From a paper:
Type IIB receptor protein tyrosine phosphatases are cell surface transmembrane proteins that engage in cell adhesion via their extracellular domains (ECDs) and cell signaling via their cytoplasmic phosphatase domains. The four human R2B RPTPs ([name], [name], PTPRT, and PTPRU) are type 1 transmembrane proteins and share a common extracellular domain (ECD) architecture of one MAM (meprin/A5/μ), one immunoglobulin (Ig)-like, and four fibronectin (FN) type-III domains, with the most membrane proximal FN domain undergoing furin cleavage in the secretory pathway. Previous studies have shown that [name], [name], and PTPRT form homodimers, but not heterodimers, in cell aggregation assays. The homophilic (trans) interactions of R2B RPTPs determine their subcellular localization and have been proposed to function as spacer clamps between cell membranes.
Numbering used by the authors: 481 to 590, 596 to 628, 642 to 723
Amino acid sequence: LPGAVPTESIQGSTFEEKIFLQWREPTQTYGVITLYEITYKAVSSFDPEIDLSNQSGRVSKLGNETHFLFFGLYPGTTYSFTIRASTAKGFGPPATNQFTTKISAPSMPAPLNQTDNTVTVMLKPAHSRGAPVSVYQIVVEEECYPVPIHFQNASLLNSQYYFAAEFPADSLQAAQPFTIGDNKTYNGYWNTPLLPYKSYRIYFQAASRANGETKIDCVQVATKG
Ligand SMILES: *[C@@H]1O[C@H](CO[C@@H]2O[C@@H](C)[C@@H](O)[C@@H](O)[C@@H]2O)[C@@H](O[C@@H]2O[C@H](CO)[C@@H](O[C@@H]3O[C@H](CO)[C@@H](O)[C@H](O)[C@@H]3O)[C@H](O)[C@H]2NC(C)=O)[C@H](O)[C@H]1NC(C)=O
């Protein structure tokens, strides 16, 4: 039977939904390696809403080239990989290492009463894809947005947009109406009344922080003339 794959030769370059797995051949080989068998298994995730009990599988990589690309993984998730080499007589001992996929931006959902100074929209919660949703943001743009800007500074900084509101994701845990321009302050952002002679498009934005990376996505929810 062939030997073990060296554990520290196993190296992975990770993406949101892929891991490129790479190793070296067994230290001693009896015969010729016909295939490698890799077991994969999710060990943990930063995503608060995920089922790990079925995030498992097995691949038989034919040939003896010492790499394989794993598609269909879940973001923000640590997968354990166990590799066995097979000679025509059978499998050698297992080697194991583990790697973590990157987090992706939360899943964005796909007007109610427009007045001279305001617009109200039905906000729908975004869903975690590798990390919780941390904050939602509402962006007002004059005719995504990683740089937050408060209305009071938007003219001096000469920005076409401002952040009208920001909420922690424990607010908006079910669908709720929200009024652009209600003059209230949300997380230090002033939901300034819209100007009745200006035209605006309004965006709903969501962010995930975990593992030191931050990922954001956004969707347009309304226009006002
Ligand atoms: C890793 O795999 C390579 C490629 O071989 C091919 O894939 C394997 C998974 C098996 O299915 C092989 O049957 C298949 O051909 C192996 O390279 C091959 O090594 C053998 C033995 O050294 C070579 O056979 C000899 O080749 C010389 C000419 O170079 C002839 O004169 C001999 O009569 C004899 O046929 C074979 O040619 C070679 N194949 C290629 C394409 O170079 C490699 O040995 C293997 N290594 C391990 C550790 O498994």
